[PDB]
Amino acid sequence: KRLKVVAAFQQSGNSPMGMVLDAVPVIPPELRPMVQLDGGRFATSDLNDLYRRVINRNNRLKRLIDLGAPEIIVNNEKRMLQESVDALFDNGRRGRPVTGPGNRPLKSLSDLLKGKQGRFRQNLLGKRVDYSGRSVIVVGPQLKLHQCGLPKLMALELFKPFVMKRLVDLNHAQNIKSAKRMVERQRPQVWDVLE
Amino acid sequence: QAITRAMADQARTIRIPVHMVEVINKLGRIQRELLQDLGREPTPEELAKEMDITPEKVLEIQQYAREPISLDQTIGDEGDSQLGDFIEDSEAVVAVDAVSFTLLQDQLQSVLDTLSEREAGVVRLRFGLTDGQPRTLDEIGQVYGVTRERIRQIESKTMSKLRHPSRSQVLRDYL
Amino acid sequence: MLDVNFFDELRIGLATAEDIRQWSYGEVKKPETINYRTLKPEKDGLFCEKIFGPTRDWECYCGKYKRVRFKGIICERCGVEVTRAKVRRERMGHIELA
Amino acid sequence: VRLTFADIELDEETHEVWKAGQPVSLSPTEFTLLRYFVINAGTVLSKPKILDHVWRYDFGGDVNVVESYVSYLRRKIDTGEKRLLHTLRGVGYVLREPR
Amino acid sequence: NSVPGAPNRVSFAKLREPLEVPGLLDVQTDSFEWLIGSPRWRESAAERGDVNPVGGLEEVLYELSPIEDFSGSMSLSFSDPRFDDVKAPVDECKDKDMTYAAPLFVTAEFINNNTGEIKSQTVFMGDFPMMTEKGTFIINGTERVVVSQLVRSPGVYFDETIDKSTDKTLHSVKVIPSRGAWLEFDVDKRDTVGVRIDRKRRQPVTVLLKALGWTSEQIVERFGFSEIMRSTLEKDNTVGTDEALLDIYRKLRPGEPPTKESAQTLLENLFFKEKRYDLARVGRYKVNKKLGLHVGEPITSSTLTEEDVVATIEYLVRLHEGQTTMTVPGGVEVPVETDDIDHFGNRRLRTVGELIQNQIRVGMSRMERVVRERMTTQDVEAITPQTLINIRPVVAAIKEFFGTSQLSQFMDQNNPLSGLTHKRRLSALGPGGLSRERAGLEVRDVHPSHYGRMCPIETPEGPNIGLIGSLSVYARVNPFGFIETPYRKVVDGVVSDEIVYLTADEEDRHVVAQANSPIDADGRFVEPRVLVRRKAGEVEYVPSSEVDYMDVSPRQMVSVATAMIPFLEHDDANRALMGANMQRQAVPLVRSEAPLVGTGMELRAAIDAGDVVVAEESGVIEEVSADYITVMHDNGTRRTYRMRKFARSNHGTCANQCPIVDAGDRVEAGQVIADGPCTDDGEMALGKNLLVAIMPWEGHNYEDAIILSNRLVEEDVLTSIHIEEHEIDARDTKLGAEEITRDIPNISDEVLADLDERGIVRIGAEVRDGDILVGKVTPKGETELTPEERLLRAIFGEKAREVRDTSLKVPHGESGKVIGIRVFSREDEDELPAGVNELVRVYVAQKRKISDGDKLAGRHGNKGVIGKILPVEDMPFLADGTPVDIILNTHGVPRRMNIGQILETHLGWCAHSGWKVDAAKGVPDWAARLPDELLEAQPNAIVSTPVFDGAQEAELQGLLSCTLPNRDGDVLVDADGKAMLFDGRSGEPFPYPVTVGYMYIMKLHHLVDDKIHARSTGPYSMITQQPLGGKAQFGGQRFGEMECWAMQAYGAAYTLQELLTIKSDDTVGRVKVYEAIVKGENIPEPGIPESFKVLLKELQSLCLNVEVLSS
Ligand SMILES: [Zn+2]
């Protein structure tokens, strides 16, 4: 059991130095955004809280070490720094998970890759797509095998740019900016050009 | 003192100076102590007297005291979705206005090519079309070997011939 | 590295401190994100405009440059490079632990 | 069609202003600043916005011009120390009747 | 009947109910009265336990008092909880969206023990929300209902387990007390005992028994017969009470050094003190009853007693030994048996009173902590009760309970039935309950103890199946939270009219009999052996002289919603469940015709729903009108009833209320006055009566589809008004303010013609999708003004238009007229939120006709969308020429075990036609048991049928035999039930007869208009550039990985690539493809998805060196 890892370390040119950590990277801000929800209320990705915690712990450790402190205080601060780091990487892996308001665990980096809510299974294997819709089905006994019904409004919204180019090509609306209101007002000349 | 300084400077997601959070805390204290003495939440006007400031500043304090919310909490009654799934990216490209703008600049260049090439260059350099730098009249003169007054006359010619309704109709619809 | 859909290998390994400080576009040293009044990022904060790049397109923090003519050239006053806002999605920072 | 606020009255036709009914003449750009203010009375104006709109985009000068101008408007119309044309530090200038 | 305004509903009931159903809202009204302490509850408690008549608020206040200080020279007490009048009436409060509440006042008592001081300050505690008459709380204007929940009742629970090694029946017990530490006693694989305390898998009984101050002498005195414990006592390895105490402290509270007193005080502080462990009063009673400790002592001292641990140990050991009766020294004998966990005798009902009291208690404790903290720091003798009391935590706790707690959700009102069943329903989720994933198959079942307590039909069919249920019609809540039902008692074959109420466990000792039994008008049953239900759920035959109890009536094991289904006993459990579910989802029509065939519960349900106004006091009617009714009482004074017209419901349904009285007809107290949304003549009416053909028709009704006649469209038979509310907020911003004006930049006229000069729509102007609704002008700010704009402004003279038109656009897929404007403003001096200056709520209504795709369903669970709306010519029609109304597929009837629907159809046709049984030459044999006044009936009469005591098959056959014609001589429906129909298309008669009749059909709230969605290019999320989800935004269908599996199976690689790259993720790909199908140019190659890059960045920032290698 020990060989199946030490041999892997030996064969590769990977130094185990990185297996312990000396500096921590910071994810780009857009992936941890703070979007101002309308009404003045803000909203953050809860990673910023963990980043603030680890930055605070690091800054306090710097102050204590360069000020001159009892070893108990410095060791305790190092312990909290370690705890903040593991909470950032893996919330709730050990000890009580660090919660915020409302008594709920905070999302860590590893929490973004687990289960059906993770990046993989939710946003990479499956995705929400454009040019689509959903409706109720009814029996189509007068149709053929290859045929299928489609609601008129549903088709109109689905084939938007197609009818724009077709109607402008047919000179329905001199310009596509006009074609916007041309189709959204659902004037009668859109139906035949849609068909 | 150390604990209070830390709480003021470091415990808030949005940083607030100590002078401001002191008055925020004083407002909270006076409001929550006046609730018992009045049995009714006071409209700012009245707390303005205690703070000796205008109620507008009290309202500004109140709307500044709110804290950001989290984007991960489940907003549904049952647990199936997150709040961030309902947030629209404002900076995202609508992909229709950009295409519209491409044909729009095509229409612009077609319309201006109707005008004289000298006038077309004048307006192009005037509003920064070829570049992002609109230029002063002296630059137009030195690139045309002409005085600034004649470029003023040229600009008069351009925006007069431009008002000619054939151009006006074909450019008006695109808005 | 430049992503033109010509890939033959996806290699993953341990990330030493040297690699992460090679990736980083600066060091974060302040737990501040957004000013409570101007609603703009601070200096050396979690949303550092200088480190992670400009927010507005072709704009510096101090407003010295606001036009597409400047490209790639870094402002000498605020230190913000002038480029697209997608670098805020791309660029990443790092923290030096004591 | 004339534009009014408090005691300031504007005529856009022949370019003259009324401040509670006594004559006044005023400089062109200062007139344009007052026009931009009254047309956005009830909205605060930010300095870069003003130099953008009323002032020509190629303005490469400093910023102190706008404060000199608004000082001219104050000394012309709001002679008192407290004014109807309020100032917000770093946010620009606006036309408010004081509460 | 027995109701003053009751329409005559002749019923096929065979036996008389000894009692009528109680007030169906009592499960909440009674609890709230008990919590308040109102005289209404006071008088009831005066005869049902007046030994300790105490209100819930009174109880918690007495529990907290007297709070003390550290030393004991200072003390404070609470007493006399009094309320005041409501701030505003219900309608006014709902209109201006505050919370319906009344002030709370409690007289504190500050006592200075050292010297003696009394300070009786009357302290304001807050605006306590109050329950309305309907039982619905109002918070911030909306209607909220707190649903009762089921939890494990605190107490002891002996369980038995198999070690699967030597077939040894192991035993265990779990003392599960609320707000306390768990204690587990059991027998492990060997013959020792496991006494694990706070999940520490060690410490046999020896250490605890010695830690209770006992020596081995008393242990061997008590236990000489238990070989299990004697051996454990021999291998104690620990001697001395101090040794046991320190061992327990070591294995329970490590890290701190032990002393001679640390463990001694810790043991008392853990289980014998009320500050860290206190099973509730119900828990104490449960322990007493189970162990037989106390039987005639007032309930007090909720903390655990020393006798309890010894009794539990003895009970567990004797159960392990295999005994049957255990007797504690000093208590009555009790049976020895393991305790089931799903039996209703062990599952409580935390109703609204208990939940509100618990949240009040946590707020009480928080403010008490604050009071204690201030009670020492502040100087003595300058102290008033106002100084200590901080009411913020209490109001915060109650407000946080009412909002954002799944135990208190929206009051769904799409019909009165939904409102009724939202209350009187039992949930299993929430704080202290179990989640769906936590729920095993044992919880979701139907325990035999549910009979009469909880209905086994009414249940959501989704993932919450078996967890959320509904209370029965006759059930009642006992004072301790146990669900209690009444039952008749029988002696020596004589049933008295004495009605006793029994809990779940009480039914074990007795024997309950059949609900419908052959009573001989003296109580004796013709045969001795009668189907009865025994203790353990076994149903066997028992001689008549042996049974001691018999059920109150049929439909006692049923719920109110599922008591409206006629011929319930003929329907399968699954289809009955489904039909009960769609009963709540019916929408209010514009006529709401009473069903031709129904059950007697409809009238009572309509009256008790609360949305049908009932004349509280009798008298003549002074004047009647659409908007108001004024009744002239018998004594001088009058009463006026303000009516509600087109009031928007919580689910976008109308709430019309039309009066049904005349100008001068005397009315009686308790009589219906005006019908509700789904009521007519004071009884339930959720649908309409329609002609039915059970034949298949050209496949347009294939696979549960339905085809309706366009007459229903023309005659407005099936049409429902839908009120929609749109909100706009005009807040404060560093742009200044948002004005509600008409100065919107760049607008035409034909769109602005129907909008008044005040910034809103004219009342009564039709709008559709995309139209401007409220003009909220906003200063645009400044950004990069395009150079092209600068050129453009000189060609038409357009001004800058410095304001962004942030107006109200009517969203897609809705239209209709405008009802009215409710405008709020700070200038109007209203309590708008901070920064918000104006609030405008516009109401839009449209008349939604029936159309294909709308879901229709009967009461037997037959669902389906509308296959086709075809004209009246194209339908089968009888020899009378009456076109059929609805058509159902025959294949769905036998394959779904819902045979009751055709029975209802036959009965409906009989009621529609009428009958005159020819009892001239003696009464017919089938009609002999059939009651009087039923042999004669008028056309379009109304009949009733109780769910289990209803019309039999022979009675239906007899009714079908006599089917007197309408106007001519024509018996269209023959004796067997079928009828002759001619095709409306070809015109030839169908070769075989088809059954016809009238069935009740209701529209469901699953209209196709609210479920149609399409999206070309909408918004995208922040983190990933994928589109959003849901009809509220532009949406965009989700393409899950299972669909990707089918994509791969076909091998259509390019289609999957486009779907995952350019229709979802790649921004540059998105704009490029849009440009492609506007320029008519070929669609370019997909790029690199952005979500993959974002994943790469998370991996890179997670300290994982990840690099993509070109070669
Ligand atoms: Zn700069």
Give the DSSP per-residue string, B93-133.
--SSHHHHHHHHHHHHHHHHHHS-HHHHHHHHHHHTSSSS-
Give the whole-angstrom CA distance, residue B151 versus residue B165: 24
Nearest alpha-carbon partner for E26 in E569, E328, E420 = E420
Nearest alpha-carbon partner for E904 in E12, E7, E272, E6 = E12
Distance from CA of A121 to the nearest CA of E (A): 8
CA torsion, ordered E614, E617, E622, E625, to nearest 10 deg: -20
Report B:109-168 residues touching C (Cβ under 8 A): 131-133
Give the whole-angstrom CA distance, residue B93 versus residue B96: 8
- Residue contact D58–B134, C-beta within 8 A: yes
Give the whole-angstrom CA distance, residue E525 versus residue E514: 11
> In this structure, what token pair is assigned to residue E54?
């105490």
Q: How far lies E49's CA from each of A193, B73, E52, E299, in Å?
A: 80, 47, 7, 12
Chain D partners of E734 at a C-beta cutoff of 8 Å? 44, 91
Distance from CA of D47 to the nearest CA of B (A): 20
The answer for residues whose C-beta is within 8 angstroms of residue E296's C-beta and 6 or more apart is: none
Helix or strand (DSSP H, E) at E393: helix E392-402
Give the whole-angstrom CA distance, residue A11 versus residue E319: 63
Q: Is C48 known to sit in a ligand binding site?
A: no
> In this structure, what token pair is assigned to residue E613?
């106004």
- Residue contact D53–E737, C-beta within 8 A: no
Nearest alpha-carbon partner for E1003 in E417, E583, E565 = E583
Rounded to a whole number of angstroms, the distance between the first and last alpha carbons of chain C is 32
- Residue contact D40–E779, C-beta within 8 A: yes
Interface list for chain C against chain B, based on CB atoms closer than 8 Å: 31-36, 42, 67-69, 85
- Tokens 């859909």 belong to C5
Nearest alpha-carbon partner for D45 in D97, D91, D99 = D91
> In this structure, what token pair is assigned to residue E1054?
């390019």
Number of H helices, E strands in chain D: 3, 5
Chains that touch C (3 or more CB pairs under 8 A): A, B, E
Contact call for residues E278 and E177 (beta carbons, < 8 A): yes
CA torsion, ordered E886, E887, E890, E891, to nearest 10 deg: -110
Q: How far is the CA of C81 from the centre of ligand 1 (A)?
A: 8
Give SS3 for A127: strand
C10, burial (CB in 10 Å: exposed 0-12, middle 13-18, buried 19+): exposed
- Residue contact E1074–B95, C-beta within 8 A: yes
Give the whole-angstrom CA distance, residue E432 versus residue E153: 11
Contact call for residues E1063 and E1086 (beta carbons, < 8 A): no
> In this structure, what token pair is assigned to residue E127?
């605006």
Give SS3 for E712: helix
- Ligand 1 (ion): residues with CB under 5 Å are C 60, 62, 64, 75, 77-78
Contact call for residues E925 and E531 (beta carbons, < 8 A): no
D98 touches B: beta carbon within 8 Å:
no
Contacts 24+ apart (CB under 8 A), E456-463: E456/E557, E456/E573, E457/E558, E457/E559, E457/E562, E457/E573, E457/E576, E457/E577, E457/E580, E458/E421, E458/E425, E458/E559, E458/E561, E458/E562, E458/E577, E458/E580, E458/E581, E459/E577, E459/E581, E460/E581, E461/E577, E461/E578, E461/E581, E463/E436
Give the whole-angstrom CA distance, residue E365 versus residue E359: 10
- Tokens 């077309």 belong to B120
Q: Which residues pair with E857 in a beta bridge?
A: E1002
- Residue contact E1108–C10, C-beta within 8 A: yes
Number of H helices, E strands in chain B: 9, 1
> In this structure, what token pair is assigned to residue E101?
């509440």
Contacts 24+ apart (CB under 8 A), E364-370: E364/E60, E364/E61, E364/E64, E364/E394, E365/E64, E366/E393, E366/E394, E366/E397, E367/E391, E367/E392, E367/E393, E367/E394, E368/E64, E368/E67
Chain C partners of B133 at a C-beta cutoff of 8 Å? 67, 69
Contact call for residues E410 and E142 (beta carbons, < 8 A): yes
The answer for residues whose C-beta is within 8 angstroms of residue E1060's C-beta and 6 or more apart is: A127, A129, E1039, E1044, E1089
- Residue contact D57–B134, C-beta within 8 A: yes
- Residue contact B132–C69, C-beta within 8 A: yes
> In this structure, what token pair is assigned to residue E423?
């209350």
Number of H helices, E strands in chain E: 27, 52
> In this structure, what token pair is assigned to residue E390?
């901080």
The answer for residues whose C-beta is within 8 angstroms of residue B96's C-beta and 6 or more apart is: A180, E1017, E1074
- Tokens 């200075």 belong to E112
Contact call for residues C48 and C33 (beta carbons, < 8 A): no
- Residue contact C47–A34, C-beta within 8 A: yes
Give the whole-angstrom CA distance, residue E482 versus residue B80: 34
> In this structure, what token pair is assigned to residue B148?
């600034």
Maximum Cα–Cα distance for chain B, whole Å?
A: 82
Give the whole-angstrom CA distance, residue E403 versus residue E396: 11
Chain C partners of B10 at a C-beta cutoff of 8 Å? 31
Chain D partners of B135 at a C-beta cutoff of 8 Å? 58
Read out DSSP for E722-771?
Answer: EEEEEEEEEEEETTEE-EESS--SS--STTTTTB-TTSSB-TT--B-TT-
Give SS3 for E974: coil
Peptide bond into A16 cis (omega under 30): no
Contact call for residues E889 and E696 (beta carbons, < 8 A): yes
C57 touches A: beta carbon within 8 Å:
no
The answer for residues whose C-beta is within 8 angstroms of residue E475's C-beta and 6 or more apart is: E452, E453, E454, E483, E484, E485
Nearest alpha-carbon partner for D44 in D97, D10, D87 = D87
Nearest alpha-carbon partner for E942 in E4, E8, E13 = E8
Contact call for residues C5 and C20 (beta carbons, < 8 A): no
Nearest CA in chain A to E1011: A135
Total Cβ atoms within 10 A of residue C36:
13
Query: Which strands sit side by side in the sheet containing A34-36, from one edge to the other?
Result: A34-36, A42-44, B69-70
- Residue contact B168–E386, C-beta within 8 A: no
Contact call for residues B113 and E796 (beta carbons, < 8 A): no
| SS3 per-residue string spanning A16-64 | HHHHCCCEEEECCHHHCCEEECCCCCEEECCHHHHHHHHHHHHHHHHHH
- Residue contact E782–D42, C-beta within 8 A: no
> In this structure, what token pair is assigned to residue E711?
């007459």
Give SS3 for E172: strand
> In this structure, what token pair is assigned to residue E90?
């219900």
Resolution in A: 3.5
Give the whole-angstrom CA distance, residue C48 versus residue D75: 43
Q: How far lies E770's CA from each of A173, B71, C83, in Å?
A: 19, 30, 38
Contact call for residues E419 and E651 (beta carbons, < 8 A): no
Give the whole-angstrom CA distance, residue E414 versus residue E609: 12
| SS3 per-residue string spanning E809-829 | ECCCCCCEEEEEEEEEECCCC
The answer for residues whose C-beta is within 8 angstroms of residue E174's C-beta and 6 or more apart is: E156, E157, E159, E182, E183, E184
Nearest alpha-carbon partner for E339 in E505, E535, E158 = E158
Give the whole-angstrom CA distance, residue E947 versus residue E570: 9
Total Cβ atoms within 10 A of residue E40:
13
Give the whole-angstrom CA distance, residue B133 versus residue E980: 88
Sign of the C-alpha dihedral computed for residues E420, E424, E428 and E432 taken in this order: positive
The answer for residues whose C-beta is within 8 angstroms of residue B124's C-beta and 6 or more apart is: B112, B130
Q: How far is the CA of C61 from the centre of ligand 1 (A)?
A: 5
Q: How far is the CA of D89 from the centre of ligand 1 (A)?
A: 21
The answer for residues whose C-beta is within 8 angstroms of residue B167's C-beta and 6 or more apart is: B111, B114, B161, E795
Phi, psi of E920 (to 5 degrees): -90, -50
Give the whole-angstrom CA distance, residue E520 versus residue D52: 100
Helix or strand (DSSP H, E) at E680: strand E679-680
C26 touches A: beta carbon within 8 Å:
no
Distance from CA of C10 to the nearest CA of A (A): 16
Distance from CA of B77 to the nearest CA of D (A): 41
Contact call for residues E685 and E448 (beta carbons, < 8 A): no
Q: How far is the CA of E785 from the centre of ligand 1 (A)?
A: 21
Nearest alpha-carbon partner for E424 in E381, E465, E475 = E475
E strands along chain C, which residues? 9-14, 93-96
Give the whole-angstrom CA distance, residue E626 versus residue B63: 46
E strands along E492-627, which residues? 494-502, 512-513, 530-533, 539-542, 549-551, 597-598, 613-615, 619-624
The angle formed by the CA atoms of residues E132, E135 and E137, to the nearest 5 degrees, is: 65
Give SS3 for B172: helix
Give SS3 for D53: helix
Phi, psi of A4 (to 5 degrees): -65, -5
Contact call for residues E888 and E693 (beta carbons, < 8 A): yes
Bridge-based pairing state of the strands E679-680 and E683-684: antiparallel
Read out DSSP for E188-214?
Answer: -SSSSEE--BSS-S---HHHHHHHTT-
Contact call for residues E432 and E535 (beta carbons, < 8 A): no
> In this structure, what token pair is assigned to residue E476?
């009642």
Total Cβ atoms within 10 A of residue E71:
9
Nearest alpha-carbon partner for E959 in E1011, E1009, E924 = E924
Q: How many CB pairs under 8 A join A and E?
A: 167
Partner residue facing E736 (CB), from D39, D44, D49: D44
Maximum Cα–Cα distance for chain C, whole Å?
A: 49
Q: How far is the CA of C66 from the centre of ligand 1 (A)?
A: 9
Interface residue of A36, A38, A46, A91 to substitute, partner B, most B CBs within 10 Å? A46
E1030 touches A: beta carbon within 8 Å:
no
Partner residue facing A46 (CB), from B63, B67, B72: B72
Helix or strand (DSSP H, E) at E578: helix E573-583
Give the whole-angstrom CA distance, residue B54 versus residue B162: 53
- Residue contact A61–C98, C-beta within 8 A: yes
Contact call for residues E1014 and A157 (beta carbons, < 8 A): yes
Query: How crowded is the C-beta side of E630, counted as CA atoms within 13 Å?
Result: 4
Q: How far lies E473's CA from each of D66, E19, E454, E505, E601, in Å?
A: 79, 12, 9, 20, 9
Partner residue facing E787 (CB), from B88, B129, B159: B129
Phi-psi label, residue E1110: left if phi above 0, alpha if psi -120 to 50, beta otherwise: alpha
Query: How crowded is the C-beta side of E308, counted as CA atoms within 13 Å?
Result: 24
Contacts 24+ apart (CB under 8 A), A186-189: A186/A156
Give the whole-angstrom CA distance, residue D40 versus residue E167: 89
DSSP E570: G
Bridge-based pairing state of the strands D8-11 and A34-36: unpaired
Give the whole-angstrom CA distance, residue A43 versus residue A39: 11
> In this structure, what token pair is assigned to residue E485?
């039902």
Total Cβ atoms within 10 A of residue B30:
15
Read out DSSP for E612-623?
Answer: SEEESS-EEEEE
B134 touches D: beta carbon within 8 Å:
yes
Asked whether at least 3 C-beta pairs link A and D within 8 Å, the reply is no
DSSP A124: I
Q: How many CB pairs under 8 A join D and E?
A: 25
Give the whole-angstrom CA distance, residue E470 versus residue E476: 12
Q: Which residues pair with E1003 in a beta bridge?
A: E856
